[PDB]
From TrEMBL, chains B, C:
It is found in: Secreted; Bacterial flagellum. Belongs to the bacterial flagellin family. Flagellin is the subunit protein which polymerizes to form the filaments of bacterial flagella. In C.crescentus, the flagellar filament is composed of multiple flagellins of 29 kDa; 27 kDa and 25 kDa. This is Flagellin.
Length: 53, 54, 54
Protein backbone atom coordinates (compact mmCIF):
# COMPACT_ATOMS: atom_id res chain seq x y z
CA UNK A 1 0.00 0.00 0.00
CA UNK A 2 2.81 2.43 0.88
CA UNK A 3 4.64 1.79 -2.39
CA UNK A 4 1.44 2.52 -4.31
CA UNK A 5 1.07 5.81 -2.41
CA UNK A 6 4.64 6.87 -3.19
CA UNK A 7 4.31 6.03 -6.89
CA UNK A 8 1.08 8.03 -7.10
CA UNK A 9 2.76 10.96 -5.36
CA UNK A 10 5.70 11.08 -7.76
CA UNK A 11 3.32 10.81 -10.70
CA UNK A 12 1.34 13.72 -9.29
CA UNK A 13 4.61 15.67 -9.10
CA UNK A 14 5.96 15.22 -12.61
CA UNK A 15 3.05 14.24 -14.89
CA UNK A 16 1.50 16.38 -17.62
CA UNK A 17 -2.04 17.03 -18.85
CA UNK A 18 -2.20 15.96 -22.49
CA UNK A 19 -5.63 17.52 -23.07
CA UNK A 20 -4.05 20.96 -22.70
CA UNK A 21 -0.99 20.04 -24.75
CA UNK A 22 -3.22 19.12 -27.70
CA UNK A 23 -4.77 22.60 -27.78
CA UNK A 24 -1.40 24.29 -27.36
CA UNK A 25 0.06 22.16 -30.17
CA UNK A 26 -2.76 23.11 -32.54
CA UNK A 27 -2.37 26.82 -31.84
CA UNK A 28 1.42 26.69 -32.19
CA UNK A 29 1.27 24.80 -35.49
CA UNK A 30 -1.11 27.41 -36.90
CA UNK A 31 1.12 30.22 -35.64
CA UNK A 32 4.21 28.67 -37.26
CA UNK A 33 2.40 28.32 -40.58
CA UNK A 34 1.44 31.99 -40.33
CA UNK A 35 5.00 32.97 -39.42
CA UNK A 36 6.47 31.35 -42.52
CA UNK A 37 3.99 33.27 -44.67
CA UNK A 38 4.79 36.51 -42.83
CA UNK A 39 8.50 36.01 -43.49
CA UNK A 40 7.70 35.37 -47.15
CA UNK A 41 5.76 38.65 -47.26
CA UNK A 42 8.64 40.51 -45.62
CA UNK A 43 11.20 39.16 -48.10
CA UNK A 44 9.44 40.56 -51.18
CA UNK A 45 10.01 44.15 -50.03
CA UNK A 46 12.44 46.41 -51.95
CA UNK A 47 11.77 44.49 -55.18
CA UNK A 48 9.94 47.52 -56.61
CA UNK A 49 13.09 49.67 -56.77
CA UNK A 50 14.15 48.19 -60.11
CA UNK A 51 11.21 49.81 -61.92
CA UNK A 52 12.58 53.26 -61.08
CA UNK A 53 15.78 52.64 -63.06
CA UNK B 1 -3.14 15.43 -13.38
CA UNK B 2 -6.55 13.98 -14.36
CA UNK B 3 -5.13 13.17 -17.82
CA UNK B 4 -1.82 11.47 -17.01
CA UNK B 5 -0.73 8.68 -19.34
CA UNK B 6 1.87 7.16 -17.00
CA UNK B 7 -0.16 6.37 -13.87
CA UNK B 8 -3.65 6.14 -12.43
CA UNK B 9 -4.60 5.61 -8.79
CA UNK B 10 -8.02 4.18 -9.59
CA UNK B 11 -6.54 0.89 -10.76
CA UNK B 12 -4.28 0.72 -7.70
CA UNK B 13 -7.15 1.23 -5.25
CA UNK B 14 -9.39 -1.21 -7.12
CA UNK B 15 -6.58 -3.78 -6.89
CA UNK B 16 -6.19 -3.20 -3.16
CA UNK B 17 -9.91 -3.69 -2.51
CA UNK B 18 -9.96 -6.83 -4.67
CA UNK B 19 -7.04 -8.28 -2.70
CA UNK B 20 -8.83 -7.58 0.58
CA UNK B 21 -11.92 -9.39 -0.66
CA UNK B 22 -9.76 -12.34 -1.76
CA UNK B 23 -8.19 -12.59 1.70
CA UNK B 24 -11.59 -12.64 3.40
CA UNK B 25 -12.72 -15.31 0.94
CA UNK B 26 -9.67 -17.39 1.82
CA UNK B 27 -10.50 -17.19 5.53
CA UNK B 28 -14.13 -18.21 4.99
CA UNK B 29 -13.14 -21.10 2.72
CA UNK B 30 -10.69 -22.37 5.34
CA UNK B 31 -13.47 -22.28 7.94
CA UNK B 32 -15.74 -24.28 5.63
CA UNK B 33 -13.05 -26.85 4.79
CA UNK B 34 -11.93 -27.63 8.32
CA UNK B 35 -15.32 -27.03 9.95
CA UNK B 36 -13.93 -24.95 12.81
CA UNK B 37 -12.88 -21.38 13.56
CA UNK B 38 -9.59 -22.05 15.37
CA UNK B 39 -7.96 -24.70 13.17
CA UNK B 40 -4.30 -23.66 13.20
CA UNK B 41 -2.00 -21.65 15.46
CA UNK B 42 -2.40 -18.54 13.30
CA UNK B 43 -6.13 -18.18 14.01
CA UNK B 44 -5.75 -17.84 17.79
CA UNK B 45 -2.68 -19.00 19.68
CA UNK B 46 -4.21 -19.11 23.15
CA UNK B 47 -7.39 -20.99 22.26
CA UNK B 48 -5.57 -23.39 19.94
CA UNK B 49 -3.04 -24.29 22.63
CA UNK B 50 -5.79 -24.71 25.22
CA UNK B 51 -7.78 -27.03 22.96
CA UNK B 52 -4.74 -29.14 22.06
CA UNK B 53 -3.77 -29.68 25.68
CA UNK B 54 -7.37 -30.40 26.69
CA UNK C 1 -10.44 39.75 -30.41
CA UNK C 2 -12.50 37.00 -32.10
CA UNK C 3 -9.55 36.30 -34.42
CA UNK C 4 -6.60 36.11 -32.02
CA UNK C 5 -3.85 33.63 -32.90
CA UNK C 6 -2.23 33.56 -29.44
CA UNK C 7 -5.11 32.52 -27.17
CA UNK C 8 -8.65 31.20 -27.08
CA UNK C 9 -10.90 30.88 -24.04
CA UNK C 10 -13.08 28.16 -25.57
CA UNK C 11 -10.36 25.55 -25.13
CA UNK C 12 -9.73 26.68 -21.55
CA UNK C 13 -13.39 26.42 -20.56
CA UNK C 14 -13.79 23.07 -22.32
CA UNK C 15 -10.77 21.81 -20.37
CA UNK C 16 -12.24 23.03 -17.08
CA UNK C 17 -15.55 21.27 -17.70
CA UNK C 18 -13.76 18.07 -18.73
CA UNK C 19 -11.73 18.13 -15.51
CA UNK C 20 -14.89 18.57 -13.45
CA UNK C 21 -16.46 15.56 -15.14
CA UNK C 22 -13.31 13.52 -14.50
CA UNK C 23 -13.41 14.38 -10.79
CA UNK C 24 -17.04 13.30 -10.49
CA UNK C 25 -16.17 10.07 -12.31
CA UNK C 26 -13.36 9.44 -9.83
CA UNK C 27 -15.75 9.85 -6.89
CA UNK C 28 -18.32 7.47 -8.39
CA UNK C 29 -15.66 4.87 -9.21
CA UNK C 30 -14.37 5.01 -5.64
CA UNK C 31 -17.90 4.42 -4.37
CA UNK C 32 -18.26 1.40 -6.65
CA UNK C 33 -14.87 -0.06 -5.69
CA UNK C 34 -15.24 0.16 -1.93
CA UNK C 35 -19.01 -0.34 -1.87
CA UNK C 36 -19.67 2.50 0.56
CA UNK C 37 -20.11 6.27 0.58
CA UNK C 38 -17.91 7.16 3.56
CA UNK C 39 -14.81 5.03 2.96
CA UNK C 40 -11.99 7.37 4.01
CA UNK C 41 -11.59 10.40 6.26
CA UNK C 42 -11.87 12.79 3.31
CA UNK C 43 -15.46 11.81 2.49
CA UNK C 44 -16.88 12.81 5.88
CA UNK C 45 -14.76 13.18 9.00
CA UNK C 46 -17.56 12.99 11.56
CA UNK C 47 -19.36 9.95 10.17
CA UNK C 48 -16.10 8.11 9.45
CA UNK C 49 -14.86 8.63 13.01
CA UNK C 50 -18.23 7.57 14.44
CA UNK C 51 -18.28 4.37 12.38
CA UNK C 52 -14.69 3.46 13.29
CA UNK C 53 -15.30 3.85 17.01
CA UNK C 54 -18.61 1.98 16.81
Amino acid sequence: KLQDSLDAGVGNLVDADLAKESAKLQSLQTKQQLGVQALSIANQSSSSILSLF
Amino acid sequence: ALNSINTNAGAMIALQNLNGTNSELTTVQQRINTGKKIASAKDNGAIWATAKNQ
